[PDB]
């Protein structure tokens, strides 16, 4: 089998157990759903999900081996309610009967898997992500949690890699067949919430191979993703992020048609607990179609216009049609049907691994075969001979074209972009 005993998934504006065992799922009015299989646990009282497992079929009494897998997205701390953020722990999923079973909790930047046997004995294992990174790859972004249990070790894997281990030999009989309650439960703030996707309970200790494969499979999509992990949308407003220059951002140079590269403003307050680089900075960009359009979701290989808002107007990102050197500065300008420029971009995901990055390829014709260059950041000449001075600019380069063909794909490339929309899970 798939060794699966619970499989919540989405159907007809509801959640449902598709494991094949027909558990009874009850979703109250406080839980928000979407067709992309996500659901949101809020602070309000009626924001819970009760699952009544099937007591009438299999051996619903205890498990020596079992795993729990799901995707999650956890909002960033409030810049003032930091003390509350660190101090208060709260339960999100609870499965107890007769004061025994498992529960999953969150204390600030730490996520916790706790076991309790019938004797009252308790044991925990957790995962903590740094809250001082200039760019955090876990905060407010979707990642993949898997928790494997036998009778020796409780393990926590994040995105396919083992991240934590705990000895549970002292741990004895655990009661599994209790009601499963998805609810924010603790000393939380009014503005507290959690996003979850693809919840599944297995009756086996999944191997690292099985877990990594499950991660790759559930991570796959025909469409592209933004900075947080959600689908990448046409006609939506975005900031831009360079995977190779984490601390940099684009700004239209004063009295100029080119793109300057400046440094991200950081957390400038006097907490000695946290640190981040501002994300809602730089020119506000926006993706447009180029014409079977359907939904406003940006898919791979689609042809697009990269526009952005300057003052009170939508401008476009062009390139000069024939430039001599390896690379050339990009030409930002009002929207025109011009002769000297290409305006059409083909959006690619050259990476074979689960990533949130995409790349921008300039082509001659959408029917053609010749490739101009990729979009990135380059260091151009600027000043005098006495003292060499160079400057980072919003560029198009032919150099990336051969680099993308290198395997395994280099994540730190400058042709790798990620789009950052305003999200209620990120304040600054």
């Amino acid at each position, epitope marked *: 089998l798939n060794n699966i005993i619970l499989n919540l998934r989405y159907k007809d504006n509801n959640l449902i157990d598709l494991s094949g065992y027909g558990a009874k799922v009850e979703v109250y009015d406080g839980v928000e759903l979407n067709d992309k299989n996500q659901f949101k646990l809020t602070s309000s009282a009626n924001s819970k999900i009760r699952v009544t497992q099937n007591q009438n079929i299999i051996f619903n009494s205890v498990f020596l081996d079992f795993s729990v897998s799901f995707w999650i997205r956890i909002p960033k701390y409030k810049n003032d309610g930091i003390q509350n953020y660190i101090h208060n722990e709260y339960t999100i999923i609870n499965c107890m009967k007769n004061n025994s079973g498992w529960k999953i909790s969150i204390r600030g930047n730490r996520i916790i898997w706790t076991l309790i046997d019938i004797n009252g004995k308790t044991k925990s294992v957790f995962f903590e992500y740094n809250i001082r990174e200039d760019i955090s790859e876990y905060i407010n972004r979707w990642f993949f949690v898997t928790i494997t249990n036998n009778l020796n070790n409780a393990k926590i894997y994040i995105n396919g890699k083992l991240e934590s281990n705990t000895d549970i030999k002292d741990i004895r009989e655990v009661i599994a067949n209790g009601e499963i309650i998805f609810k924010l439960d603790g000393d939380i703030d009014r503005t507290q919430f959690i996003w979850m996707k693809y919840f599944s309970i297995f009756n086996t200790e999944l191997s690292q191979s099985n877990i990594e494969e499950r991660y790759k499979i559930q991570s796959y999509s025909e469409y592209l993703k933004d900075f947080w992990g959600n689908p990448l949308m046409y006609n939506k407003e975005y900031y831009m992020f360079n995977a190779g220059n984490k601390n940099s951002y684009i700004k239209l140079k004063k*009295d*100029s*048609p*080119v793109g300057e590269i400046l440094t991200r403003s950081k957390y400038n307050q006097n907490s000695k607990y946290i640190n981040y680089r501002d994300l809602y900075i730089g020119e506000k960009f926006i993706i447009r179609r180029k014409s079977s359009i359907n939904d406003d979701i940006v898919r791979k290989e689609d042809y697009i216009y990269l526009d952005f808002f300057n003052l009170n107007q939508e401008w476009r990102v062009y390139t*000069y049609k*024939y*430039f*001599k*050197k390896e690379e*050339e*500065k990009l*030409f930002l300008a009002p929207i025109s049907d011009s*002769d*000297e420029f290409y305006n059409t971009i083909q959006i690619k995901e050259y990476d074979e691994q689960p990533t949130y990055s995409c790349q921008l390829l300039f082509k001659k014709d959408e029917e053609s075969t010749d490739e101009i260059g990729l979009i990135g950041i380059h260091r*151009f*000449y*600027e*000043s*005098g*001979i006495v003292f060499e001075e160079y400057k980072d600019y919003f560029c198009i380069s032919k150099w990336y074209l051969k680099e993308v063909k290198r395997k395994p794909y280099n994540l730190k490339l400058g042709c790798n972009w990620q789009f950052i929309p305003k999200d209620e899970g990120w304040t600054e």
Partner: nanobody, 125 residues
Framework: VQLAESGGGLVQPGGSLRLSCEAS????????VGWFRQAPGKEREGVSC????????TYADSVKGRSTISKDNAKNAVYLQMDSLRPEDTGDYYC???????????????????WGQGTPVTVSS
């Protein structure tokens, strides 16, 4: 980082004149370069421009046949030869450097970053 500007002033309708500029400040190899004329009662207009190398230069239609333009990477300088002058080509003349190497078909003041300070030419009776 400024641009020196040379070339004479007063000439008679039909003559010729050479205007030059020295790159005292930055190196000049990798930047396209342009010339702009501004007559009294008008806004600055492009006359001619050259690629960062020598791939090809573009001219305004009126002087199209008349003027020719050159660039020296050794002397770090750029020159504009204007022949058979008209009594209309009179005004202040300026030079500038582009952000890009390519010299586009049409000439936009937006692309050019340095300027200063201006050498005047006059064509009249």
């Amino acid at each position: 980082v400024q641009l020196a500007e040379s070339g004479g002033g007063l000439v008679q309708p039909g003559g010729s004149l050479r205007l030059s500029c020295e790159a005292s400040g930055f190196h000049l190899e990798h930047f396209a370069v342009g010339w702009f004329r501004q007559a009294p009662g008008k806004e600055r207009e492009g006359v001619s421009c050259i690629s960062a190398s020598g791939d090809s230069t573009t001219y305004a239609d009126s002087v199209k046949g008349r003027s020719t333009i050159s660039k020296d990477n050794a002397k770090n300088a750029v020159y504009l030869q204007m022949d058979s002058l008209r009594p209309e080509d009179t005004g202040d003349y300026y030079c500038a450097a582009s952000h890009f190497s390519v010299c586009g078909k049409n000439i936009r003041k937006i692309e050019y970053r340095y300027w200063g300070q201006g050498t005047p030419v006059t064509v009249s009776s």
